[PDB]
Design a protein around this ligand. Structure first.
Ligand SMILES: Cn1nccc1COc1ccc2c(c1)CCN(C[C@@H](O)CNC(=O)c1ccnc(NC3CCC3)c1)C2
Ligand SMILES: Cn1nccc1COc1ccc2c(c1)CCN(C[C@@H](O)CNC(=O)c1ccnc(NC3CCC3)c1)C2
Ligand SMILES: Cn1nccc1COc1ccc2c(c1)CCN(C[C@@H](O)CNC(=O)c1ccnc(NC3CCC3)c1)C2
Ligand SMILES: CSC[C@H]1O[C@@H](n2cnc3c(N)ncnc32)[C@H](O)[C@@H]1O
Ligand SMILES: CSC[C@H]1O[C@@H](n2cnc3c(N)ncnc32)[C@H](O)[C@@H]1O
Ligand SMILES: CSC[C@H]1O[C@@H](n2cnc3c(N)ncnc32)[C@H](O)[C@@H]1O
Lengths: 300, 625, 625, 322
């Protein structure tokens, strides 16, 4: 079986689909990882390329290259699982318990050899995936870290947002790496702009998505897109990308450069947890939700 | 032994996890009853109608296991004091749901966090849950010594940490607690789970907490140092705090992951047990008093009622008190008659209040010790004890001792005494009417006569204790004033309290009273400098007494007689707690009042704010003459 | 084991005597605290000033020995109700003195005799002693089954014994008790030491006593017969009475001298232990109920509140109840669909109130037993139990069972049911609002549908019990009506009580209610013939229920389901006890009242005297809808 | 739960300002709901939800005679004793035009839908007499374009200082209940020997018809009152304002009090213990409107400058039966 609460969906460059799920109810509170080289057949357990069971639930994951999978676990662990060379098995590479609470967010840095993890233990940690050790451990926030997101091009730059209403830009080259980018509502999701290395977007718990230029600490634009917490933001692979927003209001939205809505979907019956764009068809957007649905949308 | 639990936020299999943590040696497990990441919608569709089950089944454990081994933890996403109305409503519904499920499981305790200043709606929901249904679960408010905002690393360039010191600011967490329990009206089911950080705060912050109802102390694994062999240890100051908590008999909760990954996880608990075994050994007083900690005892009547046989039996076994009395009598006999008179002079001793005759035998031993002659009278108003006295006088004492079944105020003495000896002192010295009795008796003391005790003095000290305030509040009884329990003193081995200022003398009495207008009514004003922020709930009372010259007894803490268990401190509560700031002065006033029939105390606080005059005209507490 | 004591009136050496009687095997010793022949003067001289000691010393035993092994006996010369005023005053003083000495010794119980009709001043002195000081000694009133005047030999020529029978006259001793405890206002510290004579009285006299607070049964050695081997034995009727007393767990006191002088004294106690070992073995119900004897339980809310997990856990272990339910469902399935239809016809079953699913599995077993097809709905309003239900439906049941988290009165059913099954019956059948719930649910029952239970009926019976009356009186709480505790029914395993008449049906409900004006309000009048003199304190309540045709459950004593522990009887008390004579009729009236929000009972006694209408408009007890 | 006595109707019927304002509201609504070219073709369905002895019925009749429009009147009343008065008046005076309906508005199955519903269910704290619940139970037979009079209402709170009223509340301790229950219930009182410490600020607001799919009348509100004197806080005075129709308003708020309107006295939420407030300090109070299926009650607590106990939790001392 596959745990009902589908938590993460990520498209690989070659077209395969990675699924991370967790059992948030029932007897066992574990999790699982799955790889479908046929993404239309998901989430059928007999129609997958590979699958493995973790000990605890998967709170977040991300690809690490073409065969690596970095998992933030409920157990307080960060675990790297490497795919098979035949791509038929998912075998654990390391599983280090370094956080004193649930690891809720992970992000691979631009070099692809280091990662950033955030947890409900209020700390953020930098990981060297090769030496399987923690390089640095920062405690800049005052509440649980909701999201971390590595900059796509700068290896020492990443964003964090926590329930202390702080959004922090991090350049680990400075003696004080964190810088506060401003109090309204708590930030929940962070998404760098894929082209402009100094622009990002953040969603808040109130359903608003805002676009921020890091040069000037002021919201260039914002829009109330959802009625509930914005849980994720993913940009499309287009030359001029579209912005996919998922929320706890069970709806998916696709906005443009000026945050104007072009697509709206209510195909999900529970929380929408992750969205990923097809690298083979840029108009295809695959979303997953706690209703165990894997929906493939055709965005105009 | 240490009652210790393991805190966890990830439980895949409750059977496996409980078995593992029990094999590690823990006594209970703090876990979530719902998956902490499993947020639930209650208002708007479609997430409103998410098919169940909502959590794991109660059948996975037995009723006894649920009742003794599981502590519930409120889900972290539940924020009733959020500023988003949707989140507020969903958190209210989910908090009620999780508390009701904890009550359904019969959980002994449930954990809720205090991690911000405003927890008003959290307190509203918790109070409504407490006043709904019939459940007996404790509620542990998880509150840190230092708030996480004041613990964060100084790594934010454009938002540095204020390196300047704020006295009340570094106390803010206590206020978080104080307001919360104030909104819940001092519910006896709402206790503190104090969480200790890597860096302890200054001493005053830690001083605030030790008068509060702390039921658990939470020790993260990140605060444990590493010794030479690799085992997790604590700093010396952390060890001091752990010792203080062990005196309070709190339960110790180990949270976080295993950071000493060469050793197993039971090493932290092993170090805790090591500290517990190597604690300072208790003295004789702490052994005699074990079991009476913070147990309130209502006022008795030393003259209206008679003491039971077991009471004499237990209070007869105080060797320090009676050895001091024997030394006093011995020194007095030596100073009252020279050696050239040791055979020509017989001294008239009168034990005014002999009981079963411990002071009679003390006088006999003091005479055999000073090699002087004595003539003994043993006066006792309790006839049941007069039976014991007369049987002893027939079997042992003989002609020397004359047993007098009478009140000393009523007894027409056949002759006058050289020495009168008594032990009529209560916890507040004169609260058992020793002045009135000795005044009624001093007319048959020789003009050069000696009274033992020679004098006595009472002492008062303002205290802070939510525990004892709640204990007094719980003494409300039907068919009397709903606030009469606050207008009477209690005898209690004070324990979970905070002494706010040094004890200062209140009332003093001397015997014989060499004044023509003998008046035992008193009015006294005491000013107590307070050098912390605190909440005043009452006044502890002690006493000292001069038996003879340098021979003394004392329950005053600074001069306490070693190993003397006969007297516990007294407690004068106040109806309403009074907030005191740093540097403010607590000004209190005490009256000793009396008429022909009874004696009572009246007391009122006049600074920093006025209280009501407590026990006016003795309407709630009197001592029958 | 038997808690047995030795009564003595001659104790030369208390150490020797206690050691001897303990070597004999007794558990306590009833002795005099003063020499029984040592009369004392309190008023006039010179005997007023008799030099002491007045009795033996308390130092002859330890405090624990005094507290656990000694029962005091009032001196026999003390007669507070004498007709000589001097003797009255001296007896008052001496009775106060001896009671105060017993309190001083910490004696667990003190013995006082009731050997005449007028004990008014004795009761005055005892009540004043009870309301003086702080002591916790029990007071055993020694009262015989037959007064000594009615036991005397017929050897007085000019004063023969009346050989004619008097019904109330031979009950006179009970009146001696009843007046006494009435003068003392039913003090919980005043119990009965019933003394058994050689010739037992008629059955009714013995029937009076067994609802009274008997703490001790006194067996003189003169009543013991002699068997073939020479050991002391009892008659068969005495053995029956001893068995009844052993069910009441009284303590047995052996008094008098050793009349079987060939055997030792421990033979009487050996025979008592023999009877105790050879008592009738307890049934399954008496084993399940051991510990709940006369324990009152306040009314719960079946709809306002939710049941805890342990409650489901314990009430799930009743095999008789659920086997009867399974048989009912099985017979109904067989009678609702023939064998030629066993595959073509699926039956819609709805468990209205499923809890953790015992009736769901009962329906599954009944279907597997009748070889018929069923479609199961499990409706439950308690969400905590819905968690259990949904976990079981995912792990075991599957598509067949549909879990419905809703109130049956609120649930919009998708289809209609062939059978609805419920277990909503309280101790008084309808006191847990089964009629209202099933009325709100019967709209989705097929026009030919079946409800299990098919019907139910409540039963009432007047009872006599000073024990339970005192237990209800002790339920007065602050901040409510001082008599509200008398206006609510209690669930209690009745034990120390006397059923005065046969149980008669009170209220009856059927399902489906085939009446257009469905009204669950009721008014009923019950007449109970009483054939003894007694004191009415309340009405016991039971119920019977027809689940299906001949399948029945019952807690009515005459038809009680064997070994069924799920339901204890109910108790409707009355504020004031009502005296009933032989042949009189107890006429009681019961109302079942309701509005849109709540349901409650009202009841009043109208014969032989009127009581106040109890619980009017539900001011003291309601059942939330 | 209870029914009003005849003398109560008699005295509260003699408020000319209140009923003239109601008449003006109904008149303006009739004029704005139907044009003059329709004055004969269009009959308006009016439903007086809670008619009592019929003062709003005659107000509607007068407003129709004033606007020259046709109306069809329903007079719904749950108090049967007042239904006697209503039916006697309908036989003697009103006639076919008025239909008397002896029922609760939440229970009444209406034969048709109303253009206008008129009610006077407002207490001293506006919603403390359960006007929201009643009008929510009634709005299902209001036309989709229907109008409710009052259109909306809002409650106001202001911290007060009064040893007199504190002692008066203290003297309300009764046997056989909580010795502090008298502090956990609101009182209607013509405040007099008191000191208003800050300006009244709005607390709770209700609109009709409630155009929200999730109609929730439970509320949680926080109010901050700047205090510019040293004083002792003993409770909170409560007033209300109501929009009957557009610019037609009623108010017992002191700054905007309707002139000569005696129908409503202020309300008083006491606190168990007086709270000292210094110059410049801020009184922060919190009010909850709570409810279950059976009852509605208020809960309130002071959180600044010091915390009080949460008053009347779970309605243990004061509820309003539904
Ligand atoms: C004449 N005679 N003959 C034989 C013996 C005697 C002396 O008889 C007495 C009788 C009573 C008292 C005294 C002497 C002196 C002390 N006094 C203290 C009270 O004023 C206040 N109570 C307390 O402080 C208190 C309460 C409970 N437990 C306490 N301690 C625990 C620790 C293990 C025992 C202390 C009561
Ligand atoms: C649906 N489901 N799933 C799993 C299990 C279930 C059935 O759950 C229940 C829950 C509660 C009750 C029942 C069934 C039926 C009986 N009912 C009796 C009350 O009406 C009155 N109480 C008494 O009579 C009483 C009180 C205390 N102890 C007693 N007996 C002692 C002797 C050893 C136990 C009896 C309470
Ligand atoms: C339908 N119908 N038919 C005929 C008449 C009616 C209208 O019947 C009513 C009946 C009752 C109420 C109203 C209308 C509206 C006002 N409402 C106020 C309550 O909410 C709170 N009470 C107070 O404020 C109060 C208390 C005591 N005296 C007060 N004023 C004194 C000054 C001289 C009178 C005010 C009660
Ligand atoms: C050791 S406690 C004081 C002892 O003295 C006795 N006592 C107290 N007051 C008096 C009094 N007024 N006259 C005689 N004995 C007294 C008490 O009964 C007790 O034994
Ligand atoms: C075995 S006790 C009766 C059972 O039925 C449930 N129950 C009682 N009343 C109702 C109701 N009205 N609707 C649904 N379930 C109910 C109770 O929660 C309990 O589990
Ligand atoms: C003038 S006070 C409000 C009036 O409306 C009536 N009323 C209050 N609530 C309702 C209700 N729910 N249904 C009908 N009439 C009501 C009252 O009985 C009173 O006459």
């Amino acid at each position: 079986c596959m745990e009902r609460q589908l938590e993460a969906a990520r498209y690989r460059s070659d077209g395969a689909l990675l699924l991370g799920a967790s059992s948030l109810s029932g007897r066992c509170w574990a999790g699982s990882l799955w790889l479908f080289k046929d993404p239309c057949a998901a989430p059928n357990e007999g129609f997958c390329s590979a699958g493995v069971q973790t000990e605890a639930g998967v709170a977040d994951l991300t690809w690490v290259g073409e065969r690596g999978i970095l998992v933030a676990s409920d157990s307080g662990a960060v675990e790297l699982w490497e795919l098979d060379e035949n791509e038929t098995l998912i075998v654990s590479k390391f599983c280090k318990y370094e956080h004193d609470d649930i690891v809720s967010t992970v992000s691979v840095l631009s070099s692809g050899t280091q990662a950033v993890s955030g947890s409900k233990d209020i700390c953020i940690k930098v990981w060297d995936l090769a030496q399987q050790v923690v390089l640095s451990s920062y405690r800049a926030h005052a509440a649980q870290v909701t999201c971390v997101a590595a900059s796509p091009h700068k290896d020492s730059v990443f964003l964090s947002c926590s329930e202390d209403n702080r959004i922090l830009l991090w350049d680990t080259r400075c003696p004080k790496p964190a810088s506060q980018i401003g109090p309204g509502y708590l930030p929940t999701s962070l998404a760098w702009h894929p082209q402009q290395s100094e622009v990002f977007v953040f969603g808040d718990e109130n359903g608003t998505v805002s676009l921020v230029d890091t040069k000037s600490t002021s919201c260039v634009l914002s829009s109330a897109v959802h009625s509930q917490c914005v849980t994720g933001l993913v940009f499309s692979p287009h030359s001029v990308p579209f912005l996919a927003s998922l929320s706890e209001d069970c709806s998916l939205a696709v906005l443009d450069s000026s945050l104007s809505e072009l697509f709206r979907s209510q195909a999900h019956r529970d929380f929408v947890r992750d969205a990923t764009w097809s690298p083979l068809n840029h108009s295809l957007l695959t979303t997953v939700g706690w209703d165990h649905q894997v929906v493939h949308h055709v965005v105009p | 032994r240490v009652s210790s639990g393991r805190d966890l936020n990830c439980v895949p299999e409750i059977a496996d996890t409980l078995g593992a943590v029990a094999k590690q040696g823990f006594d209970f497990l703090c876990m979530p009853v719902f998956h902490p990441r499993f947020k639930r919608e209650f208002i708007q569709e479609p997430a409103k109608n998410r098919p169940g089950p909502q959590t794991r089944s109660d059948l996975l454990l037995s009723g006894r296991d649920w009742n003794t081994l599981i502590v519930g933890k409120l889900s972290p996403w539940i924020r009733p004091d959020s500023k988003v109305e949707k989140i507020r409503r969903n958190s209210e519904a989910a908090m009620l749901q999780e508390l009701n499920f904890g009550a359904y499981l019969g959980l002994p305790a449930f954990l809720l966090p205090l991690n911000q200043e405003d927890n008003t709606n959290l307190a509203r929901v918790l109070t409504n849950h407490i006043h709904t249904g019939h459940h007996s679960s404790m509620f542990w408010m998880r509150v840190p010594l230092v708030a996480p905002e004041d613990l964060r690393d100084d790594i934010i360039e454009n938002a540095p940490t204020t390196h300047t010191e704020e006295y009340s600011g570094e106390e803010k967490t206590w206020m978080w607690w104080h307001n919360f329990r104030t909104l819940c009206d001092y519910s006896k089911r709402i206790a503190v789970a104090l969480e200790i950080g890597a860096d302890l705060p200054s001493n005053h912050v830690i001083d605030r907490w030790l008068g509060e109802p702390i039921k658990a102390a939470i020790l993260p694994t990140s605060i444990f140092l590493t010794n030479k062999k690799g085992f997790p240890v604590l700093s010396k100051m952390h060890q001091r705090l752990i010792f203080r908590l062990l005196k309070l008999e709190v339960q110790f909760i180990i949270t976080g992951t295993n950071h000493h990954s060469e050793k197993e996880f039971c090493s932290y608990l092993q170090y805790l047990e090591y500290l517990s075994q190597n604690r300072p050994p208790p003295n004789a007083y702490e052994l005699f008093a074990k079991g009476y900690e913070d147990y309130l005892q209502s006022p008795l009547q030393p003259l209206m009622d008679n003491l039971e046989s077991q009471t004499y039996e237990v209070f007869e076994k105080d060797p320090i008190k009676y050895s001091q009395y024997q030394q006093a009598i011995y020194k007095c006999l030596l100073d009252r008659v020279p050696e050239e008179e040791k055979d020509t002079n017989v001294q008239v001793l009168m034990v005014l209040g002999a009981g079963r005759g411990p002071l009679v035998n003390a006088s006999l031993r003091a005479a055999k010790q000073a090699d002087r002659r004595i003539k003994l009278y043993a006066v006792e108003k309790n006839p049941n004890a007069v039976v014991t006295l007369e049987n002893w006088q027939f079997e042992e004492w003989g002609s020397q001792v004359t047993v007098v079944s009478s009140d000393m105020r009523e007894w027409v003495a056949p002759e006058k005494a050289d020495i009168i000896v008594s032990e009529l002192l209560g916890s507040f010295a004169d609260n058992e009417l020793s002045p009135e009795c000795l005044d009624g008796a001093q007319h048959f003391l020789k003009d050069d006569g000696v009274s033992i005790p020679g004098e006595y003095t009472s002492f008062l000290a303002p205290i802070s204790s939510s525990k004892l305030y709640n204990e007094v509040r719980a003494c409300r009884e039907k068919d009397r004033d709903p606030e009469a329990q606050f207008e009477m003193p209690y005898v209690v081995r004070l324990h979970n309290f905070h002494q706010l200022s040094a004890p200062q003398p209140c009332f003093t009495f001397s015997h014989p009273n060499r004044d023509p207008m003998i008046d035992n009514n008193r009015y006294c004003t005491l000013e107590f400098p307070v050098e912390v922020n605190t909440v005043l709930h009452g006044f502890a009372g002690y006493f000292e007494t001069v038996l003879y010259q340098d021979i003394t007894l004392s329950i005053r803490p600074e001069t306490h007689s070693p190993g003397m268990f006969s007297w516990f401190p007294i407690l004068f509560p106040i109806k309403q707690p009074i907030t005191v700031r740093e540097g403010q002065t607590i000004c209190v006033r005490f009256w000793r009042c009396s008429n022909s029939k009874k004696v009572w105390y009246e007391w009122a606080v006049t600074a920093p704010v006025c209280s009501a005059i407590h026990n006016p005209t003795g309407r709630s507490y009197t001592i029958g003459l």
